């Protein structure tokens, strides 16, 4: 109903303005050292890590630029984004070999100087969003320099797609855990995300062309050829690879001891698949193309997520399960909820099945009633199936506010579209 | 016999020193306008075209650099190459969008400003050879800038390989004759050639890696999957395309009315296949890899050329025939003779079958006894099967001295290797 949509939008709007963005505005700007502080424990206090990761600094720039463009943050988020871009360029850009370094410490010195394409994707995404939001040409300038370096050093001109981890001087890292011989869903999906906003910023043919090529790589090489669900790791020739941990990480490794089939490799992420589908619909909007350009793929992603991933009884989306439809891990992790909020709305917009609005409300109620720590405003990172926190730090080097602010803004927008349709 | 090899080498050496290089040294340097004059009729006189093509200027730089490095030209060819590089940079480089323009007129003004990857390959090849021969860092500087632009604008990150023709501002040209929707043997084989010498010059990992990727594209996508012989044109997805003429040309179009099966599209070039195989062996030498890294491919290329392409009765190599082994066109064109001289020697070195030395001597006798215009020192461009000139201009915008000087130098070297083995 229109009354229900209005209640849902108001719930998001009040929370975003009074809870989520103030958590960050009051804590994150480091005026002494530059850049952003993002290590906050279950009480919102500094947990002390001596880290300013490329991921945390670029995701922060993305959040503050995008929220400013959308009219949130009381006008102050543009200058917060500019503070972040100053840190990226002055502390994290390699003035000899080009590209952004993986890690600095809190004082701004480089501590991991490798060139990691997952981080460089977020640099392209955040810096393009930053120029779109502020008009400062530095964002586009360094996003384009980073794009150009990926084409030079990372694109595989034989098999297509990207190699993903390099030493500082752009030589390819070693095999296996060193990261130089796999191609992954994590990198290729986020390059589609980044290239969409790069093309939105520049309007240049090359960015349109290579955004479309990245979409084709995902659809034709990364998604399961029968089920359409994301497969995580490939060898260079796009045969499926055994899943491994890399030396370079950007998340905490969780093992759920009660998860099923822990040695199976047919596992796929409902959250990642929803994220891919709604980001693909956003790319198609930016490209001026209809969603049914990729009807079969979008339908497979969303159908699989709603049929298997949604916990109708307790609320929220499970972590992972098989391509063929068995759930493996029913813990409740934060970013997958965020990406299913946006994805279930876009599934309803395109596919028009009421199950997607039922799924949206299920996930929305889980997020507001269980996952948000309303005392502080941030989201618990990991919970039991029934919604009891397992891990309680509010944020760290890899959990900032990229998924949650974007899901609040993009959900309130899509709910408005649905009400108006 | 050793006596025979010594006679063959002496014949080449005397001709190269006293006939071929003086033809060019006495005619080509344009001191008034810069760059090189290359339009000479059947009497060695200026035929008047108001053209300085990227192909003619870069191939000239390659010839004079490579011949100087080999100890030919009486010391004067390094400065001739430098004169050419001055013209390439000062008249043919696009200081706004980057890359070298396709065509200038004789006064040095740009008349076709498109960015054509076939020409840009010869820029990478010639400029890398120029730094190797002279130590002037400008060659490597602009070869690397051109490499970097090809990766940014031309590489297809989905299907692999390169799109091949662009407007001045690097937007992709239109479909069909405009050149923006085919991938070709001509471009991809010459990129392997150029990247070999780029990697010889720089020693950088990225150039090694992408040279190897280009070799793999050729072997896995461009050569016939059964016969190993080059297929000329593909769509972007590497399905075979109907052969078409492009608006942008770099040769004169010849029709042999007595050629067989003129509408067949299973035609392949013995000269191109020999050129590919010996350039691949040269790449493997530069890479420090054994020839049997690609034994099957090299054997198919050379076996097909000697079994079908060599005119045992009259001498020389035919123009083209089918992958499966029927000869279509028995005219005698100049560059295929040059590339079979080098290729038949390397076929003997690797495969050790005496038929390849018999083929070498057949082609060598044809070149010296029929094709060289000894009055002037250059090669007739096109002859009847029996060795009577059909076209008699000595040189033009597309026929300079790239194939013939290289075949003389590289043949006298390989004959020495064979004698010493």
UniProtKB/TrEMBL annotation, chains A, B:
Pfam families: GlcNAc_2-epim
InterPro entries per UniProt: 6-hairpin_glycosidase_sf (IPR008928), 6hp_glycosidase-like_sf (IPR012341), AGE/CE (IPR010819)
Domain of life, source organism: Bacteria
Molecular function GO terms recorded: isomerase activity
GO biological process: carbohydrate metabolic process
Keyword Cytoplasm in annotation: no
Residues engaged in binding D-sorbitol: 59, 186, 190, 398, 403
Coiled-coil portions: none
Xref: Gene3D superfamilies: 1.50.10.10
Descriptive protein name: N-acylglucosamine 2-epimerase
Origin species: Runella slithyformis (strain ATCC 29530 / DSM 19594 / LMG 11500 / NCIMB 11436 / LSU 4)
């Amino acid at each position: 109903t229109s009354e229900k949509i209005a209640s849902l939008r108001q719930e998001i709007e009040t929370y975003l303005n009074t809870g989520l963005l103030p958590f960050w505005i009051t804590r994150t700007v480091d005026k002494e050292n530059g850049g952003f502080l993002t290590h906050f424990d279950q009480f919102g206090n500094d947990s002390g890590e001596d880290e300013k990761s490329l991921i945390a600094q670029s995701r922060s720039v993305f959040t503050y630029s995008s929220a400013h463009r959308a009219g949130y943050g009381g006008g102050v988020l543009a200058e917060m984004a500019r503070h972040g871009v100053d840190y990226l360029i002055n502390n994290m850009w390699d003035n000899e070999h080009g590209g952004f370094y993986w890690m600095t410490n809190r004082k701004g010195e480089v501590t991991i100087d490798q060139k990691i394409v997952y981080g460089l994707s977020f640099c392209i995404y955040s810096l393009s969003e930053y120029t779109l939001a502020t008009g400062d040409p530095r964002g586009r300038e360094y996003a384009e320099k980073t794009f150009d370096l990926l084409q030079k050093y990372a694109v595989d001109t034989h098999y297509g797609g990207y190699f993903e981890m390099f030493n500082r001087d752009w030589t390819l890292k070693g095999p296996g855990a060193a990261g130089g011989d796999r191609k992954t869903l994590d990198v290729h999906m986020h390059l589609m995300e980044a290239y969409t906003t790069l093309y939105e910023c520049t309007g240049q043919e090359i960015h349109r062309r290579k955004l479309l090529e990245t979409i084709e790589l995902l659809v034709n090489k990364v998604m399961h050829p029968e089920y359409g669900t994301g497969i995580p790791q490939f060898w260079a020739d796009w045969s499926v690879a055994p899943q491994i941990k890399f030396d370079i990480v950007w998340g905490w490794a969780r093992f759920n001891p009660d998860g099923l089939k822990s040695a199976a490799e047919d596992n796929t992420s409902y959250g990642h698949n929803s994220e891919f589908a709604w980001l693909l619909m956003h790319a198609l909007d930016i490209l001026g193309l209809p969603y049914d350009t990729y009807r079969e793929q979008i339908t497979k992603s969303y159908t699989h997520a709603v049929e298997n991933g949604v916990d109708w009884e307790f609320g929220g989306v499970y972590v992972e399960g098989s391509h063929a439809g068995q759930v493996y891990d029913k813990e409740k992790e934060f970013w997958q909820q965020a990406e299913m909020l946006i994805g279930m709305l876009d599934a309803y917009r395109f596919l028009k099945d009421e199950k997607y609005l039922q799924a949206y409300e299920n996930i929305h109620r889980f997020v507001f009633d269980k996952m948000i720590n309303h005392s502080l405003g941030e989201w618990w990172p990991l919970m039991t199936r029934e919604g009891v926190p397992i891990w309680k730090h509010m944020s760290h080097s890899w959990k900032i506010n990229y998924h949650d602010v974007r899901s609040m803004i993009q959900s309130i927008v899509r709910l408005d579209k649905i009400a108006k349709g």
